[PDB]
Amino acid sequence: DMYIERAGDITWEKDAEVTGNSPRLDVALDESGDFSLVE
Amino acid sequence: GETTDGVYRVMTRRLLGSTQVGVGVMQEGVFHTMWHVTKGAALRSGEGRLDPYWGDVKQDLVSYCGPWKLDAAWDGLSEVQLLAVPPGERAKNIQTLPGIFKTKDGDIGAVALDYPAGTSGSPILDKCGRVIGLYGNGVVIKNGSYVSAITQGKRE
Ligand SMILES: CN(C)C(=O)N1CCNCC1
Ligand SMILES: CN(C)C(=O)N1CCNCC1
């Protein structure tokens, strides 16, 4: 059986770690909910 | 059981020990997560039970106790925060500028951040603290890097 446990408040935090790039990608979404890259 | 607003871990005892299979958001008495995390199964909250209410495999979303309540959207310009809840680790805010998933049915924001599978369902937030979507359904690109869609449902 699956169960839930509280992990935190949902808030924006000033001076959080800033990382990650911003790619623009052509994708397709299938009937199963799987995304795939189109080229 | 626990109905307080906030971010929650989704755990199971089916495998070795206690395993975190995903994350979700409690808001206005409704628990929101990704479909692939629970597969539509019921959840426990202490001594209480959460039954699924709405779900869709294609959107990869599911709500418990009521209809989907999260209606904020990424503005297409500003940076956001992934409120990551990794297995066995503390909740951590990570600020990033989303990229774009371009599809035949329209454009969706995407976050290029890589966390273990059990982090699926962690919320993505705007500057007001509003949940603009959930992390955990995406793709792997050319350099082996994971990019997740900012997946949001519709509030009726
Ligand atoms: C620790 N972390 C968020 C990652 O695995 N990243 C590094 C920078 N952006 C891409 C993936
Ligand atoms: C859905 N999800 C977050 C995953 O399965 N990932 C991303 C790529 N690295 C392993 C874990």
Give me the resolution in angstroms, 1 decimal: 1.5
CB hemisphere CA count around B50 (13 angstroms): 31
Instruction: Tally C-beta pairs within 8 A across A and B.
Output: 153
Best residue among B82, B111, B113, B119 to mutate for probing ligand 1's pocket (most ligand atoms within 8 Å of CB) is B113
Residue nearest to atom 6 of ligand 2 (CA): B117
List the domains of chain B with CATH numbers: 6-64 (2.40.10.120), 80-149 (2.40.10.10)
Write out the H or E segment, with its range, that includes residue A37.
strand A35-37
Token readout for B52 is 């699924």
**In whole angstroms, what is the distance from residue B89 CA to residue B66 CA?**
29
- C-beta pairs of B24-28 under 8 Å, 24+ apart in sequence: B24/A4, B24/B121, B24/B134, B25/A10, B25/B70, B25/B121, B25/B123, B25/B131, B25/B134, B26/A4, B26/B2, B27/A10, B27/B69, B27/B70, B27/B131, B28/B66, B28/B69
CA proximity to B139, closest of B130, B131, B148: B148
Task: Check CB contact of A8 with chain B, cutoff 8 Å.
Answer: yes
> Is there a catalytic annotation at residue B45?
no
CA proximity to B58, closest of A25, A26, A28: A28
Phi and psi at residue A8, to the nearest 5°: 165, 175
Task: Check CB contact of A32 with chain B, cutoff 8 Å.
Answer: yes
CB neighbours of residue B144 within 10 Å: 7
Taking every pair of Cα atoms in chain A, the longest distance, rounded to a whole number of angstroms, is: 41
CA proximity to B23, closest of A17, A6, A11: A6
**In whole angstroms, what is the distance from residue B12 CA to residue B9 CA?**
10
**In whole angstroms, what is the distance from residue A27 CA to residue A20 CA?**
19
Residues 6+ apart with CB under 8 A from B26: A4, B2, B3, B4, B5, B6, B7, B8, B32
> Is there a catalytic annotation at residue B60?
yes
Residues B125, B81 contacting (CB under 8 angstroms): yes
> Is there a catalytic annotation at residue B36?
yes
Phi and psi at residue B36, to the nearest 5°: -60, -20
- How many angstroms separate the Cα of B147 from the Cα of each of B9, B73, B101? 21, 18, 9
Residues B147, B141 contacting (CB under 8 angstroms): yes
Best residue among B80, B89, B93, B114 to mutate for probing ligand 1's pocket (most ligand atoms within 8 Å of CB) is B114
Phi and psi at residue B133, to the nearest 5°: 160, 175
CA proximity to B124, closest of B58, B75, B55: B75
Interchain proximity B101–A35, CB inside 8 Å: yes
Atom of ligand 1 nearest to the CA of B96: 9
The 3-state secondary structure of chain B, one letter per residue: CCCCCEEEEEEECCCCCCEEEEEEEEECCEEEECHHHHCCCCEEECCEEECEEEEECCCCEEEECCCCCCCCCCCCCCCEEEEECCCCCCCEEEEECCEEEEECCEEEEEECCCCCHHHCCCEEECCCCCEEEECCCEEECCCCCEEEECECCCCC
